[PDB]
Amino acid sequence: QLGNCSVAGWILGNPECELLISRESWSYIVEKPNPENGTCYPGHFADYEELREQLSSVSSFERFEIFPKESSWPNHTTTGVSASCSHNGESSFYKNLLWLTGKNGLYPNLSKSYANNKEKEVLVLWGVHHPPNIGDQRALYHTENAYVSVVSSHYSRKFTPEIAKRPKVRDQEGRINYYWTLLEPGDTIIFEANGNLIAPRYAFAL
Amino acid sequence: DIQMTQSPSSLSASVGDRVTITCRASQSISSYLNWYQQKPGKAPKLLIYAASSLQSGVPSRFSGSGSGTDFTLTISSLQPEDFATYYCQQSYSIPLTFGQGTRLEIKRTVAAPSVFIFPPSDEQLKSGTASVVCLLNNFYPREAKVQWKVDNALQSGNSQESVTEQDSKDSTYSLSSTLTLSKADYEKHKVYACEVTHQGLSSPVTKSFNR
Amino acid sequence: QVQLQESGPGLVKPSETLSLTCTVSGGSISSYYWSWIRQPPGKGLEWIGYIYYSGSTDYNPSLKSRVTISVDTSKNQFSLKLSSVTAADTAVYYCARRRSDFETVDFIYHYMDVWGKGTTVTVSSASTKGPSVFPLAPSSKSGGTAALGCLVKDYFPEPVTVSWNSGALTSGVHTFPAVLQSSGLYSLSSVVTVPSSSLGTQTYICNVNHKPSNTKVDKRVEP
Ligand SMILES: *[C@@H]1O[C@H](CO)[C@@H](O)[C@H](O)[C@H]1NC(C)=O
Ligand SMILES: *[C@@H]1O[C@H](CO)[C@@H](O)[C@H](O)[C@H]1NC(C)=O
Ligand SMILES: *[C@H]1O[C@H](CO)[C@@H](O)[C@H](O)[C@H]1NC(C)=O
């Protein structure tokens, strides 16, 4: 049961999506015909339908912190929030993602990796920020030429995020594109970046 | 592309007063306006960024407000140090334009100048030119008349004056009047006088020397 | 902690090129915009352009053809070059840091927070000339106040710096704005009011510095 939230909203961590008792059981989810709370920050969720179908029928579920805020990101700023993902008249963000930006005027090249040791496959989501102007790009990630590299044994993307001013949606001209994969046991997923990576915080083992 | 217009061009306010100056953008810029304070001979100093955010190190008596096209810089309690030219600047787009500036002058009580005269020096006279300097020190207001007279004749076209910028502590002015003569013409005469008239002086003050 | 200092010649011949350098101390060129601003005498501020630490430039359209801003991470410096200079380019030139800042990523703004001291550049076909300094001696004067001074005369170009007693004496000192004489040379007077008693219990020496001619002369001022 998702109430006013979509699968996107529930699985990404929309603050207005307070479905947190989770569970391991339904076969079917639930949605409204036109859910109001999904991707609060505008952008494109890659393979949405495919996720909804693969997310139908879960026998065992749990939400765990794949990259914990306090220990995983020492060289970067993790406080990024938006007035588009607002919770109680107060700018917030996705609960299962982290908006990494610069700390002390730098964005150092990062390299993070998670080895699946849960016997079962873990659902990993992330994002890539596409700023509306080069100024925001420079202000946030301290480079003009960013790369985001998500690599596993069944998935391999080499992102080159581009500046584009898009029509204002939810008061924003910038976009965060949403991506996901299923990580099989024994496999290890490696994130590498120098900007624009909305990093995963919580994943899902099903 | 964005032109910036400040108002007023100049203003005089007293110590303790609340002074407000306005900046206007030709087209909207939202909150992308900065305020600067420039004191004479110093570089511009950042006061408020993002239209309303006070820069660290700046007194809290400075406040910025506004959005869109119309902005205001406010000094809650004017202090004599606050004598400066104030500029607005847009940070909205290239080519980063400044306002034309507002000159804030401090209004204070009338203060009569102290008058001094300095005959040319033998060192200078040896080179064959004579500067006679008259000093008016620490006066208010700025308006002052300084008339040279050599041998009881009133001079014209051979004196040039300079004035200091308003003092950061006592809000006073100081002026120099310099009479420039050839060594020849200087020795041809004897009595040199500086007559000063000012609001603070009930009757004009004359300082003189003979040589 | 971070400080900027403009360096370069004060005098530049017409049609030739103005070259200014800014030096960064207390911090590094890493991740900031580095800009040049100028101000003609009595004439408000004009933005020239900036350079981002990665090399990217943005210039004022009115100067785009003549201006080259460069950055040198190797030496904590960035430079300005302005080609084919005319009397309209006579101004005080400032280097400054333009930094990006934000309280939440939804609102990202810039501002120029760190400024150099400004360097004065005159475009003239005239030669530099050091000033001649002459004493303004006190006499039967005044209460108990005495005014003495120094006449800094016939120098080019601007500016001169004058201190009293190697900077120990500051209170009561007035150094007037220079005046441009018909000769094309500048002249200014520097005065100080001291207790009349001090005229014998103290020595007074004006220190005059004119950098464009490497002139550094003192003058004793006695009754
Ligand atoms: C932080 O950056 C340093 C740079 O040497 C690197 O060694 C370290 O692994 C980074 N910390 C992480 C991985 O969070
Ligand atoms: C969720 O939807 C409700 C109504 O449809 C809306 O008021 C709210 O702004 C949305 N969530 C966010 C991002 O604030
Ligand atoms: C969600 O439902 C409707 C939109 O269908 C909205 O008007 C209502 O205020 C919301 N209620 C909740 C659960 O926040």
Side-chain angles (χ1 to χ4, degrees):
Chain A
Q1 185 71 247
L2 298 176
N4 289 345
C5 295
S6 65
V7 171
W10 158 66
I11 214 66
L12 283 175
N14 190 318
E16 286 312 46
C17 276
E18 12 46 346
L19 326 132
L20 192 265
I21 292 202
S22 343
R23 215 179 139 101
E24 63 185 342
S25 96
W26 43 95
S27 86
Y28 211 81
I29 49 79
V30 175
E31 297 208 23
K32 297 174 64 173
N34 278 334
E36 299 87 359
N37 296 132
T39 58
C40 69
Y41 197 101
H44 179 58
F45 206 138
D47 240 345
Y48 190 31
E49 299 303 324
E50 169 77 8
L51 179 62
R52 300 183 71 236
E53 181 202 344
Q54 208 153 9
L55 227 40
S56 269
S57 295
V58 175
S59 44
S60 75
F61 177 80
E62 80 151 338
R63 165 172 163 275
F64 75 106
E65 199 167 17
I66 184 163
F67 302 108
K69 183 176 208 194
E70 294 177 350
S71 55
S72 295
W73 311 98
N75 305 329
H76 291 84
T77 297
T78 60
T79 76
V81 295
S82 170
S84 298
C85 320
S86 174
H87 195 21
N88 290 281
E90 186 168 18
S91 301
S92 194
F93 196 61
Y94 298 120
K95 293 175 69 65
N96 305 310
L97 295 163
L98 217 52
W99 201 332
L100 316 188
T101 46
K103 193 184 81 175
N104 299 343
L106 282 180
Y107 200 105
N109 301 331
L110 65 83
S111 179
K112 265 296 142 43
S113 80
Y114 172 87
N116 192 343
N117 55 20
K118 303 204 178 311
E119 294 176 1
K120 57 179 71 179
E121 64 185 359
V122 51
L123 171 65
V124 186
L125 289 83
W126 62 101
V128 179
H129 182 216
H130 289 270
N133 59 81
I134 191 76
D136 293 10
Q137 166 68 23
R138 257 118 59 151
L140 293 177
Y141 317 115
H142 304 288
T143 187
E144 295 176 342
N145 286 0
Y147 66 82
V148 174
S149 151
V150 173
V151 166
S152 83
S153 305
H154 299 325
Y155 201 79
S156 168
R157 297 287 178 267
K158 264 64 170 187
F159 301 104
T160 62
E162 280 185 345
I163 298 308
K165 179 177 158 202
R166 297 306 188 89
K168 193 185 77 175
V169 176
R170 297 189 62 79
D171 203 28
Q172 296 295 101
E173 296 87 14
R175 301 288 188 261
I176 294 167
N177 291 324
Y178 302 102
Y179 295 84
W180 63 281
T181 183
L182 283 162
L183 187 60
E184 70 180 5
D187 211 352
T188 297
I189 187 173
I190 307 177
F191 289 69
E192 289 192 335
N194 60 4
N196 297 82
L197 172 67
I198 310 294
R201 193 196 179 174
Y202 289 91
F204 299 97
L206 52 83
Chain B
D1 43 334
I2 300 112
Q3 306 109 11
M4 283 291 155
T5 52
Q6 305 202 219
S7 191
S9 171
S10 62
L11 74 97
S12 61
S14 306
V15 168
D17 286 18
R18 183 179 187 94
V19 48
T20 56
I21 67 173
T22 68
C23 189
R24 169 173 286 154
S26 62
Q27 66 195 29
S28 178
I29 54 165
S30 168
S31 292
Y32 291 80
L33 186 88
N34 302 321
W35 286 97
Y36 298 94
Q37 178 191 65
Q38 189 180 29
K39 295 171 178 178
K42 294 175 74 180
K45 163 182 168 182
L46 185 56
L47 295 182
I48 287 141
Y49 54 90
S52 69
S53 306
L54 193 68
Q55 169 72 16
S56 62
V58 178
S60 65
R61 64 171 177 274
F62 290 97
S63 63
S65 81
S67 299
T69 46
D70 296 336
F71 308 90
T72 67
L73 179 65
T74 298
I75 310 178
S76 55
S77 161
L78 188 67
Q79 301 293 309
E81 317 97 66
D82 298 337
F83 163 75
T85 295
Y86 290 82
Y87 295 100
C88 61
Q89 176 242 336
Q90 60 98 354
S91 49
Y92 190 81
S93 60
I94 318 165
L96 291 197
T97 51
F98 291 90
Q100 64 276 35
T102 293
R103 293 165 298 190
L104 176 60
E105 182 202 345
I106 315 304
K107 183 186 176 51
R108 49 150 304 162
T109 53
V110 173
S114 300
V115 188
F116 306 84
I117 188 162
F118 304 105
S121 64
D122 298 319
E123 299 78 326
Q124 183 185 178
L125 277 164
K126 182 60 182 295
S127 305
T129 191
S131 298
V132 196
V133 180
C134 199
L135 173 67
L136 277 71
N137 208 35
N138 304 12
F139 57 93
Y140 195 93
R142 159 70 186 86
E143 190 187 358
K145 186 172 180 308
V146 174
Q147 185 71 244
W148 286 98
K149 61 159 53 149
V150 180
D151 289 342
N152 197 62
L154 274 57
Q155 296 298 300
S156 174
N158 56 4
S159 61
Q160 204 156 357
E161 58 179 45
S162 191
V163 66
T164 62
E165 300 266 4
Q166 197 153 327
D167 191 72
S168 61
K169 293 156 187 166
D170 56 33
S171 317
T172 59
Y173 294 102
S174 275
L175 180 149
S176 76
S177 190
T178 296
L179 183 68
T180 301
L181 301 177
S182 63
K183 180 176 160 201
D185 297 335
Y186 175 72
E187 283 162 346
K188 283 167 62 182
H189 302 273
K190 276 189 195 58
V191 181
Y192 297 86
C194 191
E195 183 177 5
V196 176
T197 79
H198 187 260
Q199 180 169 341
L201 302 173
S202 56
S203 52
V205 163
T206 310
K207 296 286 181 158
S208 41
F209 69 86
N210 296 325
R211 279 314 171 261
Chain C
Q1 303 113 346
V2 49
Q3 290 181 343
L4 306 193
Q5 183 54 57
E6 297 92 347
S7 57
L11 184 63
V12 170
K13 283 189 155 54
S15 82
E16 295 191 352
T17 301
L18 170 60
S19 299
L20 295 174
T21 298
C22 188
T23 300
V24 183
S25 307
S28 289
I29 294 293
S30 307
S31 82
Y32 288 139
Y33 300 82
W34 300 96
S35 40
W36 286 97
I37 324 290
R38 69 181 182 176
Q39 192 180 31
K43 291 187 211 64
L45 303 157
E46 172 186 38
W47 183 74
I48 290 157
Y50 58 62
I51 189 157
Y52 185 64
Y53 83 100
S54 71
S56 166
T57 70
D58 271 337
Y59 303 147
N60 193 320
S62 63
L63 304 144
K64 59 162 82 161
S65 311
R66 300 190 291 145
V67 61
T68 295
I69 303 187
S70 64
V71 60
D72 189 349
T73 306
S74 300
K75 302 171 70 186
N76 254 344
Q77 293 177 342
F78 64 102
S79 288
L80 177 65
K81 286 189 176 290
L82 186 64
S83 54
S84 297
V85 291
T86 46
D89 295 335
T90 294
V92 165
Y93 287 79
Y94 298 97
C95 61
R97 191 228 280 172
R98 184 207 184 213
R99 81 176 289 258
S100 59
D101 191 42
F102 59 93
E103 286 303 296
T104 55
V105 298
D106 276 339
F107 186 26
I108 291 164
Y109 41 74
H110 301 72
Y111 53 74
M112 327 186 57
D113 60 341
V114 175
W115 294 80
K117 282 68 191 175
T119 180
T120 299
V121 176
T122 314
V123 170
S124 172
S125 68
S127 306
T128 56
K129 183 183 279 285
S132 300
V133 185
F134 306 113
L136 298 176
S139 57
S140 50
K141 204 161 287 291
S142 305
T145 308
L148 64 102
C150 280
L151 174 71
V152 180
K153 164 129 179 158
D154 296 333
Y155 64 94
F156 183 84
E158 283 249 76
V160 287
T161 55
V162 309
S163 64
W164 283 96
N165 305 347
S166 277
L169 185 58
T170 64
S171 175
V173 172
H174 291 287
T175 304
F176 296 94
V179 178
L180 182 69
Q181 301 170 157
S182 62
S183 59
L185 300 169
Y186 291 98
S187 276
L188 62 76
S189 203
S190 189
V191 306
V192 47
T193 51
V194 294
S196 196
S197 75
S198 308
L199 287 176
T201 65
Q202 174 68 275
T203 299
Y204 296 107
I205 309 176
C206 69
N207 314 115
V208 176
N209 200 16
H210 185 257
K211 191 175 181 176
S213 63
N214 266 282
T215 300
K216 205 164 307 179
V217 298
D218 307 287
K219 215 77 194 58
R220 194 154 178 188
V221 184
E222 291 170 341

